[PDB]
């Protein structure tokens, strides 16, 4: 791997990469950060603690023009796997956690393509506040949310957007949580009915506030009441 | 970012983040302390502890971190990782779990006049003696006592954060309301030492009334 | 700031936190140890563990951390990270399932004379013989043995700060009353 060794030397030792600085030509520009969320598995919804535990893979996509290279000058290399702490990162956190775990769990490698695109898919176990409506229990449905934002950067410095996919040369935003139809194992008590994604911008907040922008992934989940039916309700009613 | 990099190079020259900013010996660092309550997570009566999620609001001045925007491309503000600058050692003294510190250091905002604003998140478990006499038709008085752990009053002077409202800030739209507790009063107070090793405190009080419908139905 | 920055830079130039901080190796590091009890968190009778919130005030003199204030703008005291200097390795000998040593490395207050005061917090989980014969009218006597784990009395001497633990900032418990307290 003499070629990517030379490429890393060219990117970080020859051009003087400073990961503390955002990838912008001027300070007033904002770094566009595209976010998508894949739900690996819904671990649980604890009603007493009012806590949703989820396993999620957070896809980050942004552009760092300092990490560009011509492939045919470096052995036709088109992609690199670099440590995430070797390159500026748009530090997104789960704002509405309720255990103090703001950050992703496994800081995996970033993938950097020759045209300057940085792709990053950290997985994470998240424990988030989900207030519980008990009115129709055990025939209840809940409305949990995973609210992602940046506390280190504000809307002036990064712009959050949804991931954009393509079909037949037509672009569309990914406005839902991604679930693999084959690999996803459904929770034994909760069925996902709706799973939208939204970019929320608060017009009242100033642009230099971390609360100006967020991306929220919502889970509308219906309880499967068979356990409670069989074990509690029929005996109690009879 | 070349201008921002140049400004960072200027600001970090000769700077020791472990040294308190005092231009002259005897100068005190004024630290304004405020609190934003994102969520009242719980009040555990068995363990006698209030679990809260908050954002601190700490403001002070570090004269070393001042600059003239005219000579730095009109840059009037910077965002700098908190570990890179001197921080007041402000902690929750009355924590119940041994955790004194904030949940995430994040970044401070530094203005050209040297004003530093820092709003770290914190998940705190604070000691609250429970008045059990009228449980479950009870109201509690759970305090959050914030103070410098090391610096004394002759080095760091505290004041209540305001812009003057002496209260915990609760954003109406985004606040995660608790299903069992109603916040009646939420003031904040600067507590002076009893009249040199002495330390002030900033105490945020949460007077909360239980909503006892569960016990009416079930008991 | 500038004076203190220069002082802190010069103090740690040839400093070693490995060796004991004495002019001569035949001397003994005199450490004053005072326990402050902030709260009696729990008395677990089944597992015989008493959980307490404490401040472990430790005072000694570092011979090499001295300066003349006149040379540094009159700076007479500073605060420095505790991880940078030699410290006594006090351990709770009868620790049950908590931490054996101090894990919260708070700043030390250093005077120009070399006097160091270090007052870290800790959650002591100590193993205590629990006599349940008279429960719920039972009286307990739970101790906290503290000592330098790796240093003997010929190289480090520990002395109590006071005959009694400091209960000035003790929070009143809703299940226990401290009838007596004493350090030996």
């Amino acid at each position, epitope marked *: 791997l003499n070629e990517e060794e030379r490429l890393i*030397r060219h990117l*970080f*030792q*020859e*051009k*003087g990469y*400073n*990961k*503390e600085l955002r990838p912008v030509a001027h300070k007033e520009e904002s770094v566009d950060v595209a976010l998508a969320l894949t739900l690996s598995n819904l671990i649980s919804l604890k009603e007493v603690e009012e806590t949703l535990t989820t396993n999620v893979w957070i896809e980050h996509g942004w552009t760092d023009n300092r990490l560009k290279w011509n492939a045919e000058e470096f052995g036709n290399i088109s992609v690199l796997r670099l*440590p995430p702490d*070797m390159v500026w990162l748009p530090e997104i956190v789960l704002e509405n956690n309720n255990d103090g775990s703001f950050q992703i769990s496994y800081s995996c490698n970033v993938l950097v393509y020759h045209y300057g695109f940085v792709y990053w898919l950290p997985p994470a176990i998240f424990r988030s506040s989900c207030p519980i409506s008990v009115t129709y229990f055990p025939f209840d449905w809940q409305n949990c949310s995973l609210k992602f934002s940046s506390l280190k950067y504000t809307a002036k410095e990064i712009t959050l957007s949804l991931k954009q996919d393509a079909k037949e040369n037509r672009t569309y935003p990914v406005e839902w949580i991604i679930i693999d139809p084959e690999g996803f194992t459904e929770n034994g008590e909760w069925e996902i009915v709706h799973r939208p994604a939204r970019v929320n911008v608060d017009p009242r907040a100033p642009l230099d506030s971390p609360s100006r922008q967020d991306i929220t992934f919502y889970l509308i989940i219906r309880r499967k009441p068979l356990f409670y039916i069989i074990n509690i309700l029929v005996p109690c009613v009879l | 970012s070349e201008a921002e*990099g140049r400004l*960072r*190079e200027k*600001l*970090f*020259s*000769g*700077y*020791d*983040s472990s040294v308190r900013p005092a231009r002259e010996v005897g100068d005190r660092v004024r630290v304004s302390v405020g609190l934003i309550l994102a969520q009242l997570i719980s009040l555990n009566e068995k363990d006698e502890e209030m679990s809260t999620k908050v954002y601190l609001d700490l403001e002070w001045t570090d004269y070393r971190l001042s600059w003239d925007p005219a000579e730095h491309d009109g840059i009037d503000s910077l965002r*700098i990782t908190a570990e*890179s600058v001197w921080l007041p050692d402000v902690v929750l003294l009355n924590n119940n779990d041994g955790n004194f510190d904030v949940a995430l250091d994040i970044s401070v905002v530094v203005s050209s006049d040297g004003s530093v604003r820092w709003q770290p998140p914190g998940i705190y478990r604070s000691s609250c003696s429970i008045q059990v006499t009228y449980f479950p038709f009870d109201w509690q008085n759970c305090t959050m006592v914030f103070s410098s752990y090391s610096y004394d009053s002759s080095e760091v002077s505290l004041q209540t954060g305001l812009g003057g409202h002496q209260e915990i800030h609760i954003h109406e739209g985004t606040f995660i309301e608790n299903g069992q507790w109603e916040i009646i009063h939420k003031p904040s107070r600067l507590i002076q030492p009893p009249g040199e090793g002495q330390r002030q405190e900033v105490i945020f009080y949460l007077i909360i009334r239980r909503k006892p419908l569960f016990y009416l139905v079930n008991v | 700031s*500038e004076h203190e*920055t*220069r002082l802190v*830079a*010069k103090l740690f*130039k*040839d400093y070693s936190s490995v060796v004991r901080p004495v002019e001569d190796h035949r001397q003994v590091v005199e450490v004053t140890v005072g326990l402050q009890l902030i709260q009696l968190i729990n008395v677990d009778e089944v597992n015989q563990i008493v959980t307490t919130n404490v401040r472990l005030k430790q005072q000694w003199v570092d011979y090499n951390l001295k300066w003349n204030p006149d040379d540094y703008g009159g700076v007479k005291k500073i605060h420095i990270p505790s991880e940078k200097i030699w410290r006594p390795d006090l351990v709770l000998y009868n620790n049950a399932d908590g931490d054996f040593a101090i894990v919260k490395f708070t700043k030390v207050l250093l005077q120009y004379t070399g006097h160091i005061t270090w007052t870290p917090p800790a959650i002591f989980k100590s193993y205590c013989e629990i006599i349940v014969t008279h429960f719920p009218f039972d009286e307990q006597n739970c101790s906290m043995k503290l000592g330098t784990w790796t240093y003997d009395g010929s190289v480090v001497a520990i002395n109590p700060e006071s005959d009694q633990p400091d209960l000035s900032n003790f929070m009143e418990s809703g299940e226990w009353v401290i009838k007596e307290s004493r350090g030996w």
Partner: antibody
Amino acid sequence: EVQLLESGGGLVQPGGSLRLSCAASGFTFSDYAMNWVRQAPGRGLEWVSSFSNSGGTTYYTDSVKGRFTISRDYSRNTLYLQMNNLRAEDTAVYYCAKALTRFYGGNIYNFDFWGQGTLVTVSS
Amino acid sequence: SYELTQPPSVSVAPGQTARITCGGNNIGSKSVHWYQQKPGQAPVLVVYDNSDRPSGIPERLSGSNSGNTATLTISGVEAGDEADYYCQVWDSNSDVVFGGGTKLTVLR
């Protein structure tokens, strides 16, 4: 035992490039600002560059600004100086020097330890 | 361009005292450091902050700073003190400034 071994110096034509390296041992590499100081043959000492972990900042003298790049190895305790567009004025013994402070600058800033250096000769 | 000024050469007999000066505008308000470079050897810090001595440096080397002059004093000149002595300071506008070194010659 503090030790600074410089390498990568040698002969290069004018306008060429060269990467000097300085392997450091015996001290915490991240607790001290690192520096490159050059000495042309028969001439005095001249500070070239400094790298500070405080804020991740780099500093260069004017004559080498835009041409030289100081960096550190991501994993190993190694300091790099990538030099480009080398002139005959850059011929010198380049020493890698450790500072007393983790930060660059301030009145107290001085080089408490020096390596033996590497000779860089720029000639056709 | 703070321009520390040093004398190119200082000559003294064995056993006498050599005084190597470094001139500058209000240098008494700055911290002056002194490095010794033997022939074909790396420089060695011999004084820092105008008077302090690193461990392993002989006590016969001392420093002073006042007004517009800093001084390095080498007493009891031995046969192995031949070296180039450089003064050094830091300035906010000029970065690291070295002086034009002073060669010490023993007058035997």
